[PDB]
Design a protein around this ligand. Structure first.
Ligand SMILES: Nc1nc2c(ncn2[C@@H]2O[C@@H]3COP(=O)(O)O[C@H]4[C@@H](O)[C@H](n5cnc6c(=O)[nH]c(N)nc65)O[C@@H]4COP(=O)(O)O[C@H]3[C@H]2O)c(=O)[nH]1
Ligand SMILES: [Ca+2]
Ligand SMILES: [Ca+2]
Ligand SMILES: [Ca+2]
Length: 251
């Protein structure tokens, strides 16, 4: 009896096999990193560094994604809370959140605990939800989103464009960025998302910026922040600290 995917994930979680990788965001117009998206990685003893799409789906169905995310947040506080010195005041730290998470308030404690691992106001904690994760729990029962804002947590909509709330940020899915220059329809729709963000007073991140064409196009329309291989791949702690060290020493 080789035990299941279930016991496998709980095992890994007890053995902290789930680690943060960190992808930088950069301002639309370039410059020092202003934040990171924390991306889960599974460092598997047997198989190597396994990537999220192979395991986040079972985490969500089994419910284990909730504890997993808590562990990840604690790890990030441990990873970065001692090195606040290297982080531009207001540095954004984003975490991907599941729909299961949006039930009940514990999440508020987790956010409070992380925030409390840095000096007050020195970072901005962001939570990324996809549009369908808001669908399914629609609208009403959310003192949760009120309680999170009153601690200064921000809410971003992930993979946007692929209803309602107080959300603070939109992240343009990489699918639109990928088609810049190459199709006018896609371009116009993307200009619309951008224009809407501004009407509603939301910040906007473009994800999957890989080329200078893409970067320049987005910048020309006042996209607030960029993320992608052009700026930097997802990377382990050591590389992030090394790269931030460089950025503090010249500007
Ligand atoms: N082609 C291309 N790809 C790029 C580029 N820049 C970044 N990426 C990849 O795009 C994904 C981040 O997007 P996501 O919409 O959060 O998509 C994430 C997110 O939905 C989910 N995920 C990751 N960590 C967590 C987590 O801790 N909790 C939850 N619920 N989901 C997570 O897994 C998805 C994939 O994560 P990764 O495999 O790390 O894949 C990452 C990242 O490595 C680029 O320039 N080009
Ligand atoms: Ca998610
Ligand atoms: Ca995301
Ligand atoms: Ca995306």
């Amino acid at each position: 009896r080789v035990a299941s995917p279930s016991s496998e994930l709980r095992r890994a979680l007890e053995a902290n096999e789930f680690i943060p990788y960190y992808q930088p965001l950069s301002p639309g117009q370039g410059g020092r990193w202003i934040g990171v998206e924390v991306l889960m990685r599974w460092r598997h003893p047997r198989e190597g560094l396994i990537r999220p799409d192979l395991f986040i789906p079972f985490a969500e169905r089994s419910g284990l994604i909730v504890p997993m995310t808590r562990a990840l947040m604690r790890q990030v506080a441990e990873d970065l809370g001692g090195h606040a010195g290297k982080l531009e005041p207001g540095f954004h730290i984003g975490f991907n959140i599941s729909a299961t998470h949006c039930h009940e308030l514990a999440l508020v404690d987790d956010c409070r605990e992380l925030l409390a691992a840095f000096p007050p106001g020195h970072i901005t904690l962001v939570l990324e939800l996809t549009e369908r994760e808001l669908i399914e729990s629609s609208e009403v029962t959310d003192r949760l989103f009120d309680e999170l804002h009153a601690l200064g947590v921000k809410i971003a909509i992930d993979d946007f464009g692929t209803r309602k709330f107080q959300v603070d940020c939109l992240k343009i899915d990489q699918s639109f960025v990928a088609r810049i220059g190459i199709d006018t329809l896609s371009g116009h729709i993307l200009d619309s998302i951008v224009e809407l963000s501004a009407k509603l007073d939301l910040d906007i991140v473009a994800e999957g910026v890989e080329t200078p064409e893409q970067r320049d196009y987005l910048a020309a329309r006042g996209v607030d922040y960029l993320q992608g291989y052009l700026i930097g791949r997802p990377m382990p702690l050591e590389s992030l600290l090394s790269s931030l060290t460089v950025q503090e020493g010249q500007g």
